[PDB]
Symmetry: D2
Subunit: 438 residues, 4 copies
């Protein structure tokens, strides 16, 4: 019987909480969602509501687009279907974290805030654990949201400059320890490290930082914003947890799962602590990020997600081979950034140094040609963000040797993304050089 | 011409940013949304994306249900359509705040966090303005999210007990000032007052608190979670701003606009300050709450929203008349709470005092009968929430004179909500009394 | 339990096949549709298809918009869900025919052809019953589809001119009988009469025609295209069946049920005959009309449909009162057409007779002003349709005394339809008269 | 600019009426559909409607699922958007007919009836051209809809038995001519031939029939129900038109385009004649089939459709290779039917002849195992359909030599359709043989 086959799939999901190997048909998915929504009190046929939060909906377009899930999520029930939705979604995500390369993950939850505010929530929770602490030690990465996250939480970021090793910018482990000793471990809220990042920065030395955190008894929060899509980044987290201390790692829903911006996952190795972060959240929250990742994971299944991850690696190879060929044809080179598995950079030395803002102009030319996501990084940008002045802003160092153009192979990239980029970049560079050579 | 008529409506919205008097047809609305989405780079036909946040979507169900808005909202652009969506939505909401009764509002923004976290954001911003402050003075209201909001922000709530005046619980203005003097104004982050609330508590004495805040130079943040739907609550805020100091007022999207849980509006009278709160938010955020309230307001228009507000007042009268008749028929009474325009309470003295947990049982019986939102409040509940032990928890006082049942006429209530509630309550009370009388 | 309440509604529908008194919520409706679609083989999870009609769908937009019903309808099964959909829909429609005023209806079915082709199907079936017959006797009504229906079926229409009685055009019963006698009853395929029609024609004298058909042993097919919405029209059919012979009556889905054009209902009093018409249909047919009327009737319920019918009568009174006031203010009059319960006409004598095509111009002016559905009927139109030349075409007579403007109160009409029409008509008439009076 | 790129695609479609080489994004498609719907009067913001067919819609679910196209299609305008929809759709389909292999097609139109009723419409039109004719000469194919089509139209089918040539059943050209001479050409309405059909019948000898029709001056209507997906079938039609007479060819929308059952395309080589068939249709008709094929073709583009056609050929090879291997492993054989490009048959001699209804049982076993579309054809079925008794019904001959199982590779078939079929068939045959061998 037709209906029993759908029931079987739904039952296997409910009982184990695991991502199905193969993706569900849309029919099964919508049957499931409609069944869950029926469980929420706002949807009961016999319901009468006499409170201030009844999940009433004025617009049919709004009700429908959300599959009639109106009550949001929490951490007798007013929304039994939404609670089941939350629980299942968190189970699927824990599973996917394991699939992605952190097999020893203990606990996780979706929070419908993006990664910056999600990091803030971790810091807000740590405040109560460490009431003496005022500082967050942070290996520099020129991205405003993660920097702000510390200031928003009410802490003083201690910016640790990176080391130039060949073309790569890497964790200055000695500088990290020197600041710990200077300021006093009891005065440090946590170390706040970062995995996936713009080349030529690479993921932080998490093994070594984890040892430092263990030894000094300082919490360690990892900004894994877009590292979940990378088995290399995820292995770093796993290894870090094996050899030292990692208290939480945070990742974007949109960047790793191809869903709208708005949600993140907070995960860790100590269940009581991760639950403490969740409990620190005041009030109900949007169910929309959770619904998006639930639909996506059930539709892809383990196989579909694994396929995307494999395809990302394949596209990274393709982008790298194509960008290196282009670069060399224009007497540039691909920066040597073997430790960055997602992001890469070619030099822009041939257009830089003419005192004409050509590097910045190139970024603009790419944008006008409907290339999104490229970063043309010039030398000497100065920018002040929330009390800190960054010299060499965009380059994660005060004195990076050259200007460069940064592109990345993130999950969902297609051959046409690479091919169009290369075609357009070639044209733009030819235009700039023509203009510069009279 | 057909198309020009739609264009006219869209143009009038874009140019002025005001809520249309009469609601748009769905056709016009969807034309508009499709046009905005086209403006976002992820939707360009000629786009190639080479970054880590390209707004790629794996599931067609996810893409469609969000009208192809994937990039989220912020405070060259990657998402021009989403930015316009954000700007328009905030304009419409400012307009509606004026319509609702705070005509002098200067600035506001939708934040896709619910009201508890939105209050936290206000507190997080005030930390930087007042680095010496550790305390938040807070007239007691037994609701976990707003209490937590203070603790989550990293501040110590100073719980001010309420005064019993007749049947009402009201602001203890003398106790508020005594704590200000005891602790020192410079040590107070803000006063955190509350408008709409469970009867028999009533909205705080905002005029008087505003004078206190002005005189002591202490910020004043108003928890207006579900007060926007009440012209009486909104007038209180307006008057408060006229006679003293109010720095921010926060309201729920779901409770005042009949949309899913997940978003709130932060509003105030000083544009630089409100903008400072917005700037304190790290990173991009979900566009989903904004889209929901945009669809809702364009669909209702000013007239449709005004109608809902009028209907709410009419339903409050109906609920009050019906509940008083029921109460008196069971030898109970309607508590005299004229200062609460949304929430009301009947006594439960006839079932209380038998040492059998009958009051709590009644709440359970109502819930099992698909009555949502009623609160059966017994005497003597003790609960500890985030470091504070509340005696008489649920009753907003240690020693409220009697047990009671609390129901409310919130926006969107229907006659059947009242009628079914009354029918079911009558039956439940008859059952309990039968059991108690052997 | 929430789910059981939905099940109860679905079970009551499946067991009895009756229209629910009150309309279902959308949630219940979509649960039901999803459950039915699951029953169709194209939707089985374990299905493999090795035939030429597997219900495969290339576009997700197409699959979704049809609720995954792909197999169409017929009169072991490949589409058990679609067959149930067909059966239920026909049951609901039979019920509604009774509600609408033909209580003695025996059998009916939805056919996804519009009313003209549906009449053709009746004629095609009668051919086999009456192989000697070549003629269809037809009281004139100037509407191309019903006229064509006879020619398309391969029969010769015998056009019976109407009688002028006061302002009304009515059935010429003597002319009908004279043609029967002249041509011979055995040579007449059927009499083809019409109920709802453009004023000042009125519904045919069905009682008297039914007696004629009974006495001469000639089938009687009633064109009830838009009469189902009228209890007066429906009573005429009922009475006709009581006092004489009516073999089939046909009505539009779109005109009586506010759904897209495309379907009709064939109904009658002799089940074997109505089933013979259904059996005459070759092959599978679209399920889309049936799905539309099923969704509509379940959503309205008996109460919602009854309400629309009552509202139509109320709007007819309003349109008549408003149009008479307008007419008289312009020195015109409302034609006296008490026997037409839907359609009415005001005279246009004041603009006619200037040899300037003013009547036709008025129709054009109304159309340019976004008035749809009005008919400005001039004198002296000659048009040939499928072998017959109609003099006075549009007026259902060769020599109707005056030009007129025809408007109607059909199901779903709103006060604004009347008010805008009246406002626009007033302006147009003033313009024409100004132009004509130099 | 983003919007201009969509406009470009829409403009190129409107100006030329051709299928885009590459498929449109959904965004472009929905923009286009919303724009067309805006053009229909029921959707005008300023519209007032005072007629009986205003396209009013009671249910939002119905309005939305049809993209607000309510007025249907025809052959001043009430539905300018629907008329454009009809015109464009017919243009795209003409284009696709050329792509599919009838390059010389002159005219075509979508009719929202399935293929049986569409053939009826052709016959109904021919009646008026040939008022003396009563007979339709028809090479036998055991399919009820196409047989009925002739009877429904009011004509007497003259069933021409097929010739056994090897394993194939083919057109008996001599028998066709003998009947023409016996009955008289002037008494023949048309020859009604068939292309795609169940093996071991093969497509009719259209070249030879076309010569016969030309020479005798008898119209020729081709039942191309599921031949459009086959370049071999389409070439036969093209060649037939080149060497003789073909007046119309009819094909299913669902079987060739992977859309819901309900529509067909009537096409031919003489524009006035094809237009005469269209003009014979009385009244408005559903727009739903046209919308489905429009969405499908714009979404696939020429490339996507070409790909499906290529994939069908590839799947036919796979099905044939797999079914032959299975058959031979069970001591059966694949019937030699090289002239049938879609349908194939393996023998069932090993289970036949035990007087136990095993062949029919096998069909039932396959059906119970969720194999759809297989046909287990036994010897000796007698069935009477609309006045004709077919001996050997299902086998297209009175005395086909053996029982067989018929499977087909139609458009949209997947490898899993073949693989599951083969796995299930193997099991079923093993079960039957076990039962038969005690
Ligand atoms: Cl990797
Ligand atoms: Cl109020
Ligand atoms: Cl009536
Ligand atoms: Cl082929």
């Amino acid at each position: 019987e037709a209906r029993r086959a759908h029931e079987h799939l739904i039952r296997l999901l409910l009982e184990q909480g695991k991502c199905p190997e193969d993706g569900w048909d849309e029919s099964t998915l919508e049957l499931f969602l409609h069944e869950l929504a029926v469980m929420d009190s706002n949807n009961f046929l016999g319901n009468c509501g006499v409170g201030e939060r009844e999940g009433r909906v004025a617009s049919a377009l709004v009700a429908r687009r959300h599959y009639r899930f109106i009550h949001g999520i929490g951490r007798q029930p007013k929304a039994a279907g939404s609670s089941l939705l939350n629980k299942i979604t968190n189970s699927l995500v824990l599973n996917v974290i394991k699939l992605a390369g952190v097999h020893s993950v203990a606990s996780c939850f979706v929070v419908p805030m993006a990664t910056g505010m999600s990091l803030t929530l971790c810091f807000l929770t740590l405040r109560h654990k460490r009431p003496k602490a005022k500082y967050i030690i942070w290996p520099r990465i020129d991205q405003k949201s993660c920097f702000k996250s510390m200031v928003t939480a009410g802490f003083e970021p201690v910016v640790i400059e990176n080391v130039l090793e060949g073309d790569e910018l890497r964790t200055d482990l000695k500088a990290v320890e020197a600041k710990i000793q200077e300021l006093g471990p009891e005065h440090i809220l946590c170390l706040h490290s970062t995995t996936a990042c713009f080349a030529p920065r690479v993921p932080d030395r998490l093994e070594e930082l984890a040892v430092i955190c263990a030894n000094y008894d300082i919490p360690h929060v990892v900004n894994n914003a877009y590292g979940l899509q990378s088995s290399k980044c995820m292995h770093l987290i796993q290894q870090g947890a094996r050899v030292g201390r990692i208290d939480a790692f945070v990742q974007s829903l949109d960047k790793n799962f191809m869903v709208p911006v708005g949600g993140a996952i907070i995960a860790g190795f100590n269940e009581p602590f991760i639950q403490d972060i969740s409990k620190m959240y005041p009030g109900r929250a949007s169910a929309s990020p959770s619904l998006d990742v639930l639909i996506t994971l059930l539709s892809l299944g383990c196989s579909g997600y694994r396929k995307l991850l494999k395809e990302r690696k394949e596209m990274f190879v393709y982008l790298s081979t194509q960008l290196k060929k282009l670069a060399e044809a224009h007497n540039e080179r691909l920066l040597q950034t073997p430790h960055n598995p997602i992001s890469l950079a070619m030099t822009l030395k041939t257009i830089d140094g003419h005192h004409d803002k050509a590097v910045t102009q190139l970024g603009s030319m790419l944008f006008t040609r409907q290339v999104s996501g490229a970063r043309a990084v010039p030398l000497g940008n100065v920018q002040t963000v929330s009390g800190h002045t960054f010299r060499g802003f965009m380059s994660h160092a005060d004195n990076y040797p050259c200007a460069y153009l940064n592109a990345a192979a993130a999950i969902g990239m297609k051959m046409q993304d690479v091919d169009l980029f290369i075609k357009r970049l070639d044209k733009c560079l030819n235009i700039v050089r023509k203009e510069q050579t009279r």
